[PDB]
């Protein structure tokens, strides 16, 4: 008919016990529309391309229509090539990359431009950029290039390659001058240990302005950085005060079906919100496919992934167009993808904390840039 009654959706998850899996299950359980999504979730090491491509080929031979999973720097090119060759959509909440196809929908919005706007707003000219090697170096190139145009002085420090003594020498060189400016671009699960390192042996107060380049400001424990003169400025994508996020979190709290793992609380992460909105865009795209009466059901079992005359299925372009032409309001706000498969037309709440509390200083858009408030 217009659409199959049950639609198989593949999934590549790094581990069984995670908050992202709980968000996936809850978002699947929330939907009650006639297009039902049957999940096939496989636990696969994301740092190995062989295991990931075996799982991808197994799910493709099973007959999935879209795959929701995570990747890394090692498996991004392989996933991009396979999705561009087999015309199979891949929806991911992982870090955005410049080298991608139109079949890869990255739910995580970019941050390499909001950070530059924030640095320009603060009139920073000499600072230390502490970055993570296994997170993508595009933002580091952008920072270095903007420094080249604007004659900045950036001291690039890698987290992996620097020991405690190197950090101590770097921070002594920082306290040699008066204005200590540090921009940290690293993930929360490592930024916690990084901030513990900063607060334990090093010190701050009356200066030491930090700009944390992350999508979640409430996801980290800033009590160690509190009660001091250090100023912390970050970015917030989701905040639980608006009507839709509060309603979603209230439905999550009073859930009749108990969630997996151990807990779903104690500083919930934004990646769970990205997973929730990924399930939501999948559901709305498939319901829009059913609404337009465009045939999606498979006419014959899918063959081997390694067929040399690999022809693309004709419904793949329709699936990609339906997944791309989506605009709804979810946990993270307005969800909308451009022609390149990345999120566009969104907002970030710029939040500053200077030994008083949490204060929103403005917001950044793709058109109005950083507007103060």
């Amino acid at each position: 008919a217009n659409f199959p009654n049950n639609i198989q959706i593949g999934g590549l998850f790094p581990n069984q016990q995670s908050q992202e899996h709980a968000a996936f299950r809850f978002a699947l359980s929330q939907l009650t529309e006639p297009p039902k999504l049957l999940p096939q979730i496989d636990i696969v090491n994301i740092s190995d391309s062989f295991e990931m491509t075996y799982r991808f080929c197994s799910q493709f031979s099973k007959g999935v229509y879209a795959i929701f999973g995570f990747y890394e720097r090692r498996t991004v090119n392989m996933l991009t090539s396979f999705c561009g060759a087999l015309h199979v959509c891949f929806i991911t909440p992982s870090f955005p990359v410049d080298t991608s196809n139109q079949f890869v929908l990255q739910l995580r919005p970019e941050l390499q431009e909001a950070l530059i706007s924030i640095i320009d707003h603060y009139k920073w000219q000499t600072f230390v950029y502490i970055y993570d090697a296994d997170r993508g170096l595009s933002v580091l190139q952008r920072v270095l290039d903007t420094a080249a145009e604007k004659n900045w002085q950036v001291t690039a420090v890698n987290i992996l390659t620097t020991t405690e003594e190197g950090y101590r020498m770097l921070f002594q060189d920082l306290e040699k001058k008066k204005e200590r400016l540090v921009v940290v671009d690293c993930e929360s699960e490592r930024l916690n240990a990084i901030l513990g390192q900063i607060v334990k042996l090093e010190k701050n107060g009356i200066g030491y302005h930090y700009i944390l380049a992350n999508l979640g400001f409430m996801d980290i424990d800033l009590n160690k950085f509190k009660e001091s003169g250090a100023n912390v400025t970050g970015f917030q994508l989701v905040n639980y005060t608006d009507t839709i996020p509060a309603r979603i979190m209230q439905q999550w709290r009073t859930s009749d079906s108990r969630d997996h793992t151990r807990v779903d609380w104690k500083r919930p992460k934004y990646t769970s919100a990205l997973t929730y909105d990924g399930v939501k865009v999948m559901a709305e795209a498939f319901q829009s496919l059913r609404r337009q009466r465009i045939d999606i059901s498979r006419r014959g079992n899918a063959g081997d992934c390694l067929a040399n005359p690999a022809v693309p299925w004709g419904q793949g372009i329709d699936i990609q167009r339906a997944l791309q032409q989506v605009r709804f309001e979810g946990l993270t706000g307005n969800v909308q993808f451009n022609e390149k498969g990345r999120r566009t037309n969104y907002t970030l709440h710029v939040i500053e904390m200077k030994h008083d509390g949490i204060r929103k200083i403005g917001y950044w858009n793709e058109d109005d840039k950083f507007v103060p408030a």
Partner: single-chain antibody
Amino acid sequence: EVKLLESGGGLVQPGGSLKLSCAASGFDFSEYWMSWVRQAPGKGLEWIGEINPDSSSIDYTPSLKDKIIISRDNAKKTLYLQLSKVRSEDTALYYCARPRGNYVVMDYWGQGTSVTVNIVLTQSPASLAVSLGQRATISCRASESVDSYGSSFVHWYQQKPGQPPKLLIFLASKLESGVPARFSGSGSRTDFTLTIDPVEADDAATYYCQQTNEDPYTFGGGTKLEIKR
């Protein structure tokens, strides 16, 4: 660990409305929803009422829904339950408890008091008595599944007569916070088991196994534990 204060237990007139003051000190009901449970003397506990953290919609007991009404304020963190046509059997020990799903430390029930106006399981041995420092194991057989939605959905509450009950083991993966009890669920656990080692005088209480897998959370007969001298 949140604090719960419940005092004012006393007899009332025939059919007069009674109210219990349950104060959430050190926290608020918005973080964890407050639920009232009524337990008869020498019998398992029953869910008297479940409320919401945002104070939007509240529930009642599955046995007597319209007979009792509970109103709670999260900002004031105060809950009061009232009823009509109170009988001799209706005067049971009512205690308020915060939601245990938020954290292990959040599973702190109120003091509870008595007045004079589900889950099916069997815990063995019923009569247990060991010296201090010994290891005690109690097996709680149940007719339902040993684990709901993958992980375990059972818990053990160490209640005493006239004292606030405490949950030691919950879901076989998170023990009691603040004071880590040596007894916790482990393994596949077809029957709920918790190896207490070493034992202590302060660790002598009635352990009742309540399964959250079967709706609703009702305390079973449990097993009695003391300190043999």
